[PDB]
Amino acid sequence: GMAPDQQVPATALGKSSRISLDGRRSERSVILADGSMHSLTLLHPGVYTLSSEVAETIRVLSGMAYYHAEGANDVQELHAGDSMVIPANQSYRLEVMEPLDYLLSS
């Protein structure tokens, strides 16, 4: 059904989701083909004030958002295929324009 670029090779998927941010963020753990574990996350359109504890690596699969680190003077745009590291102990805003599907590894 799905074209190769529309899917991510995997080994396993987690049964249980976790919902946060007033119902607007959900994720499940997954094991990718390389054996590594990520949180496969969906973030609905909206404006989110967040912070990290440990550093986060985010690989965006689909959607569009603006990332703004508290102390930065411009945003970073996130589109399909983008990646970026949220440093440890970072306050930031995500403004999601199109539902954001991403792998978060921490």
Place this chain on the structure above:
Amino acid sequence: GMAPDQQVPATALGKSSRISLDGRRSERSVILADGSMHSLTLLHPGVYTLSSEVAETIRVLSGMAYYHAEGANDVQELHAGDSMVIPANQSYRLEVMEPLDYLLSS
């Protein structure tokens, strides 16, 4: 990170989620280890009247809901591990007591 009983063997995860039901439902397509093709769905607490043109197999992964077939005299609880064929062409309800993770195929 995940014990065996927390996960389901896979081959691929769809990149792009589909959101519906006023933000209450999200699906991505997945391919399981046996090559079969399902909608991996999260349905947030609520009560929803659903239907399909074709029979679909539901396999509940996590959470709790009551299923009520169109016109039926009582409901049926579907817990983690429960699978059934949902007939086509009938307006069933799912009352989601705890966020429901499920596969839906066929």
